[PDB]
Ligand binder design. Structure first.
Ligand SMILES: O=[N+]([O-])c1ccc(O[C@@H]2O[C@H](CO)[C@@H](O[C@@H]3O[C@H](CO)[C@H](O)[C@H](O)[C@H]3O)[C@H](O)[C@H]2O)cc1
Ligand SMILES: O=[N+]([O-])c1ccc(O[C@@H]2O[C@H](CO)[C@@H](O[C@@H]3O[C@H](CO)[C@H](O)[C@H](O)[C@H]3O)[C@H](O)[C@H]2O)cc1
Ligand SMILES: *[C@@H]1O[C@H](CO)[C@@H](O)[C@H](O)[C@H]1NC(C)=O
Ligand SMILES: [Co+2]
Ligand SMILES: [Co+2]
Ligand SMILES: [Co+2]
Ligand SMILES: [Co+2]
Length: 434
């Protein structure tokens, strides 16, 4: 796609800290940009929609190439259309925003410049952020994560993409998502099927795969930490059901692991660690700090801070595994006790280290789940299982919770605030901000 300017594009500023092994931190100035899927896509030479509701213009978009040649992405009114605001080091995303139309959630990228994404090399480093999940009920996900996206949004590889990172192009993740409207500088109108339960979305003939570090998928009830490896580290198109992921009838596709090696302390048996109010170790009615460390072995370490008290990731015992480090022993024990082979089949933490060795883009989002009602995060899943099934129970939410139409109607003013991002060598991010 190209870019049009019927609506101005002003990225909300966002600062973050870069810390050094020598004990100091330096303020960095960036901004956030909304993903291309949330934007108005219209004809380059008029106001005619290329995409409207959950259907493409059959005249502007008769095939993927012609569509991209005829169509552009336009600017975003971040606050008034999308409920996205920033203040210094703080980003807030509102769940439902009513303007001329109804918007649900947002997916945003941290920028280095007004035309490029920030790339972070996680290996050997740690990432800290503060989060307020108090206004996230059952069925919502305030997500902070990394993906192996191109810094330019794909412009250098795909000449027919001239909108780039400035307009939120080039998304990929471990679901190899087929809901994207543009992949590799072409539309996704070929094979498009509208969603039966979402007036604004559908599933195309292509998807966009890449490695994914899910640092944080959470609400006020449950939280999870999940690396996902792919056989190709970086952004790669996939065809139809070969994509696997949420958007394919067969979840287990050819290149990415859509399950990951997940760590949810509730799922692992500690139902008292994280939840709303003073009966939990971490009280989700109050802001908390989350620190994630990528040791050069390829293992992942985690600790939390609230009201000046530090907690390592809680210990878990699972088969022969015992500890709080996410390592090959944990991931292998998890497959043996909870089932599945996706993570190991796609090369496990060894393959995942190929992604953290390189650059990855920071994503912050808020979404509800039109496929599985977020039950995998915060409830019993599958819903016919009980606590006698190892791993079935992931949080205290009813298996009835998280119907999109219901949570959109009942909790439209749900929101997530991410703040005080700090990045640097392992051990550096608890030092004074600059
Ligand atoms: O030692 N520490 O590092 C430490 C100790 C206590 C503590 O308490 C939390 O402090 C924050 C910030 O002052 C509180 O949040 C604010 O509370 C206000 C209540 O009127 C209002 O809602 C503000 O918007 C909100 O940010 C929080 O309730 C405390 O538990 C933090 C750190
Ligand atoms: O018996 N088993 O082996 C079995 C049966 C069902 C099942 O459900 C999967 O659980 C995983 C771990 O929670 C779920 O994965 C996640 O999917 C999210 C949305 O796509 C997001 O990708 C997370 O980061 C990821 O872990 C998966 O959706 C369930 O189908 C697991 C095992
Ligand atoms: C849950 O983890 C916290 C933090 O490590 C610990 O203090 C508490 O004892 C744990 N409770 C259970 C039931 O494991
Ligand atoms: Co608001
Ligand atoms: Co995931
Ligand atoms: Co094709
Ligand atoms: Co270690």
């Amino acid at each position: 796609q190209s870019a049009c300017t019927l609506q101005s594009e002003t990225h909300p500023p966002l600062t973050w800290q870069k810390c050094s092994s020598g004990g100091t931190c330096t303020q960095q100035t960036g901004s956030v940009v909304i993903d291309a899927n949330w934007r108005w896509t219209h004809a380059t030479n008029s106001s005619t929609n290329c995409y409207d509701g959950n259907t493409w213009s059959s005249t502007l978009c008769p095939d993927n190439e012609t569509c991209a040649k005829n169509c552009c992405l336009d600017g975003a009114a971040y606050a008034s259309t999308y409920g996205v605001t920033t203040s210094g080091n703080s980003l807030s995303i509102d769940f439902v925003t009513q303007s001329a139309q109804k918007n649900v959630g947002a997916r945003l990228y941290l920028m280095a410049s007004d035309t490029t994404y920030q790339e972070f090399t996680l290996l050997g480093n740690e990432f800290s952020f503060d989060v307020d999940v108090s206004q996230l009920p059952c069925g919502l996900n305030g997500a902070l994560y990394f993906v192996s996206m191109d810094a330019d949004g794909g412009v250098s590889k795909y000449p027919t993409n001239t909108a780039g990172a400035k307009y939120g192009t080039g998304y990929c993740d471990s679901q190899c998502p087929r809901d994207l409207k543009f992949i590799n500088g072409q539309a996704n109108v070929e094979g498009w099927e509208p969603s039966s339960n979402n007036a604004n979305t559908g599933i195309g003939g292509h998807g966009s795969c890449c490695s994914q570090m899910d640092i944080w998928e959470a609400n006020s009830i449950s939280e999870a930490l999940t690396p996902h490896p792919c056989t190709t580290v970086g952004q790669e198109i996939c065809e139809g059901d070969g994509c696997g992921g949420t958007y394919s009838d067969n979840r287990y596709g050819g290149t990415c692991d859509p399950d990951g090696c997940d760590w949810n302390p509730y799922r692992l048996g500690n139902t008292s660690f994280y939840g709303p109010g003073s009966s939990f170790t971490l009280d989700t009615t109050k802001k908390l700090t989350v620190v994630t460390q990528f040791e050069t072995s390829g293992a992942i370490n985690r600790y939390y801070v609230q009201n000046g008290v530090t907690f390592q990731q809680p210990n878990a015992e699972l088969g022969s595994y015992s500890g709080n480090e996410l390592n090959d022993d944990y991931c292998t024990a998890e497959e043996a006790e909870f089932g599945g082979s996706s993570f190991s089949d796609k090369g496990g933490l060894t393959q995942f280290k190929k992604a953290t060795s390189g650059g990855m883009v920071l994503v912050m989002s808020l979404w509800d789940d039109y496929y599985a009602n977020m039950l995998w995060l915060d409830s019993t899943y599958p819903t016919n299982e009980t606590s006698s099934t190892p791993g079935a129970v992931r949080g205290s939410c009813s298996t009835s919770s998280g119907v999109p139409a219901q949570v959109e109607s009942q909790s439209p003013n749900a929101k997530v605030t991410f703040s005080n991002i700090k990045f640097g060598p392992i051990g550096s991010t608890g030092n004074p901000s600059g």
